[PDB]
Amino acid sequence: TKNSEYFIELEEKHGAHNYHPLPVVLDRGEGVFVWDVEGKKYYDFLSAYSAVNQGHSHPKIVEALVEQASKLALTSRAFYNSKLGEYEQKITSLLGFDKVLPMNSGAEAVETAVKLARKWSYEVKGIAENAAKIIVCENNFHGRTTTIFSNDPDGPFTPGFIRIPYNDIAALEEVLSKEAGNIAAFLVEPIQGEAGVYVPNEGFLKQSSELCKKHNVLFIADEVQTGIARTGKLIACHHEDVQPDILILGKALSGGMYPVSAVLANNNIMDVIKPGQHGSTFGGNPLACAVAMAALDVVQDEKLSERAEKLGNLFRSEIEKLIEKTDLITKVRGKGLLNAILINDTPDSSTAWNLCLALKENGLLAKPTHGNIIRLAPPLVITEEQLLDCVKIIEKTILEF
Amino acid sequence: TKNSEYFIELEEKHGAHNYHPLPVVLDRGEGVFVWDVEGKKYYDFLSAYSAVNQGHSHPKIVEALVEQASKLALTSRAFYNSKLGEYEQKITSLLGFDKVLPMNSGAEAVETAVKLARKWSYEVKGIAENAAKIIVCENTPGFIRIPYNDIAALEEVLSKEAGNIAAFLVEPIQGEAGVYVPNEGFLKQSSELCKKHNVLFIADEVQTGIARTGKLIACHHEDVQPDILILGKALSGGMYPVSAVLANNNIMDVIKPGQHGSTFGGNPLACAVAMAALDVVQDEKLSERAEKLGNLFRSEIEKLIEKTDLITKVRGKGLLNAILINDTPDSSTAWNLCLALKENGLLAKPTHGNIIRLAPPLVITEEQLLDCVKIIEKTILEF
């Protein structure tokens, strides 16, 4: 009785209708594979939007969660817990920063990074306490701003922000040359993943970072999606020889086992933070820390950055060959195993969705974004043989469509 | 060696200084008790700000986490998972709502409740898109701030501009400053006033919900069924960040799939944990336990107050309680009292300088509760 349709109908009846998932009901995951309720096996080519970099149900991450959950999971920050210090030392040493501020969700970490940058710009740089601006390339704070109303009780422009095009050095230099004195930070993703996969021009991140330093503006690398080996380096900034002033991590920081996010910065920035303001009950809890330490160890011990780099090159090379055989795919873009294909149809068309249904029938799970883009992002633990099998599945699906 | 000071120094060096915790380093919890790195045992009288209502490391909740984490912890909402539907059916049936929207954090759920009320007021009530206002209580355009526990102020705002108002968003008890219990009838009259003026009543029960005040949600004390219910914290027993917004179909009908989503909201691990945490509350009758033990606790603390000039009053409902220390908010007395309580085996922390929250896990026994009273008495009388 309790088949896939049974669960879908439960959610229709009792759950808000705020999502449109691909119609598959998953109940087990192991490594690169997931199984639906009827027992069919699939390659996961979404990795829960690049949170499951270490594979589903990684034995080391499971083990860390189970160990810590039976000891102590939450004290709040009213007290110290014995795991947070160990984790803080680990991650700051690993990435080369003095300090980390732990949070739960990606949005919390981005919000916290911006608040930290504004406070720095007041305490150190000298901008008035409501006058600092943040340069952004996308709507990083969707749902929490007033443009015309914000939902947080405690051309169109968003006060406090300057929006410029992504991958546009001239636009950044124009803003900095004219009003860098008003600017606390530039907040940018090394690859934009919201509307697909937008890889910027070679050199964009490094030039942006250098321009920010020249103009006394913090460079904030939002690596919630790009971080933790996905692009072929521990963080995508490393591809560009950038060390950001503030680093934002999330998603795969926990392998997807627990919502863990982080903001890293050196003392000259982080020490503007003082006790007092209203904070997070769960941020930095010992269960989160035990999970994140294990998730980082998997990435380093299994050399997942090198694996994502090598297999990503192979993947894009093979997909480029497929593109030459079909009129259905316009281009493939990405870094490491963060890749996506643009389908040769309009964003209002059903083609990419139907291609994802066909991929599913052939044993590979992906979902469109913005109508005509398909993200292709498996866990980084995929083997070369499995990767080439996935290429064969994609080839078969495309060539038979 | 890795003693308490070692871990405190690690955090000073490598962690942001955004908190000033009580100087105790905890490494184990069971039920009402926690142990520090040196092995000293304490009663936890904060419950992680009322998230650990079911006690630390509750076996049924640990069980649920282990079972599900071993199987599948995260899919994202790009696909269905096999636990969310069962959890949605469970919590909506338990609380008497048609639908639930699952989230991670308390602030997420509050913001989602606000966004939902505004969308309702546009599609159903007819207010323009960015024109609906939300009434809230003092503890920001588009929000009307009135004093807490003030029916007259609410009535004045409604009489003057209910036509432009989507909702009133209120906590059944305010836990921010300390524990501010409103007057008898405040919540019910507020709920009735909102209905009369075609305004949604949103109960923020992130702190008060899940048995802490002696009922499954504090609205039940007052015979209020809110239009939108916000839950958080103890929904997971503290094992996982889980929050929720519940409402009937007349409100949830306005929801359609959007452009931005939550990766972790509604994931199968969160759902397995929350189902177990709810089962603990019902199976162990923790609402009844909190009601009965809360009455005993306030009665015993009132006796202690007779013996000292240090404590002004005790207030609260269920096991959400607090004491006001007889000193200024800028003084160190409450902090120093908490250091002394710690030495005598009970952990609490001040808020707003001169208030101490007293909120143990709901699984505490009468014998333990009276022992805690004895610890507080000893600490006060020896101070």
DSSP B207: T
Considering CB atoms only, which of A72, A108, A263 is closest to B56? A72
Considering CB atoms only, which of B21, B70, B79 is closest to A79? B21
Looking at chain A, the residues that come just before a C–N gap of over 2.5 A are 148, 154
Contact B37 A82 (CB under 8 A): yes
Composition of chain A by helix, strand, coil, percent to 5: 40, 20, 40
- Of A302, A321, A337, at which residue does a domain stop? A302
Within this chain, do residues A183 and A110 fall inside the same structural domain, yes or no? yes
Rounded CA separation B373/A35 (Å): 53
- Of B225, B256, B284, at which residue does a domain stop? B284
Q: Give the angle subtended at the CA of A273 by the CAs of A272 and A274, to the nearest 5°.
A: 110
**From residue A298, how far is each of A65, A101, A292, A293, B173 by CA, in Å?**
14, 22, 10, 9, 45
Largest CA distance in chain B: 66
CA A322, A308, A379, A229 dihedral sign is: negative
**Is B82 in contact with A99 (CB distance < 8 Å)?**
no
**From residue A147, how far is each of A160, A182, A248, B134, B325 by CA, in Å?**
11, 20, 25, 17, 44
* Of B298, B337, B290, the residue nearest B316 (C-alpha): B298
How determined? X-ray
Q: Which residues of A touch B24 (CB under 8 A)?
A: 79-80
**Is A197 in contact with A169 (CB distance < 8 Å)?**
no
Identify the CATH number of the domain in which residue A240 sits: 3.40.640.10
Rounded CA separation A56/A379 (Å): 8
Within this chain, do residues B45 and B71 fall inside the same structural domain, yes or no? no
Amino acid, res. B58: H
Q: Give the angle subtended at the CA of B363 by the CAs of B357 and B41, to the nearest 5°.
A: 70
Rounded CA separation B359/A78 (Å): 13
Within this chain, do residues A37 and A4 fall inside the same structural domain, yes or no? yes
Phi first, then psi: what are they for B198, rounded to 5°? 60, 50
Amino acid, res. A129: E
Within this chain, do residues A235 and A107 fall inside the same structural domain, yes or no? yes
Angle between helices B268-283 and B286-305 (to 10 degrees): 70
Q: Give the angle subtended at the CA of A251 by the CAs of A247 and A252, to the nearest 5°.
A: 95
Please list the alpha-helical segments (H only) found in A52-101: 59-69, 84-95
Within this chain, do residues B102 and B90 fall inside the same structural domain, yes or no? yes
Contact B78 A8 (CB under 8 A): no
Q: Distance of alpha carbon B266 from its chain centroid, rounded?
A: 19
**Closest CA in chain A for residue B107:** A152
B127's tokens: 């207010």
**Is B242 in contact with B230 (CB distance < 8 Å)?**
no
Rounded CA separation B52/B238 (Å): 5
**Closest CA in chain B for residue A371:** B259
B164's tokens: 């432009």
What's this structure's resolution in Å?
1.6
Rounded CA separation B75/B67 (Å): 16
Identify the CATH number of the domain in which residue B295 sits: 3.90.1150.10
- Of B284, B312, B330, at which residue does a domain stop? B284
Considering CB atoms only, which of B21, B89, B259 is closest to A77? B21
Best to test chain A binding among B76, B114, B330, B342 (most A CBs inside 10 Å): B76
Place of tokens 């069980």: B63
Within this chain, do residues B221 and B368 fall inside the same structural domain, yes or no? no
Within this chain, do residues B267 and B329 fall inside the same structural domain, yes or no? no
Contact A16 B252 (CB under 8 A): yes
Q: Which residues of A touch B111 (CB under 8 A)?
A: 143-144, 151-152
B250's tokens: 């007349």
Contact B80 A11 (CB under 8 A): yes
Our answer to whether residue A348 is catalytic in this structure is no
Helix (H) or strand (E) holding B230: strand B228-231
Q: Distance of alpha carbon B83 from its chain centroid, rounded?
A: 24
Within this chain, do residues A173 and A258 fall inside the same structural domain, yes or no? yes
Contact A75 B104 (CB under 8 A): no
Within this chain, do residues A52 and A79 fall inside the same structural domain, yes or no? no
Within this chain, do residues A278 and A178 fall inside the same structural domain, yes or no? yes
DSSP A124: I
Angle between helices B366-382 and B333-343 (to 10 degrees): 120
Considering CB atoms only, which of A48, A66, A86 is closest to B69? A66
List Cβ neighbours of A333 (8 Å cut-off, separation of 6 or more). A196, A197, A198, A199, A339, A340, A342
Q: Which residues of A touch B129 (CB under 8 A)?
A: 148
Domain count, chain A: 2
Within this chain, do residues A65 and A19 fall inside the same structural domain, yes or no? no
Structural domain containing residue A202: 58-302
Within this chain, do residues A255 and A353 fall inside the same structural domain, yes or no? no
Rounded CA separation B98/B92 (Å): 6
**The dihedral formed by the CA atoms of B50, B53, B56 and B62, expressed in degrees to the nearest 10:** -120
Pairing verdict, β A41-44 and A33-36: antiparallel
Q: Distance of alpha carbon B32 from its chain centroid, rounded?
A: 17
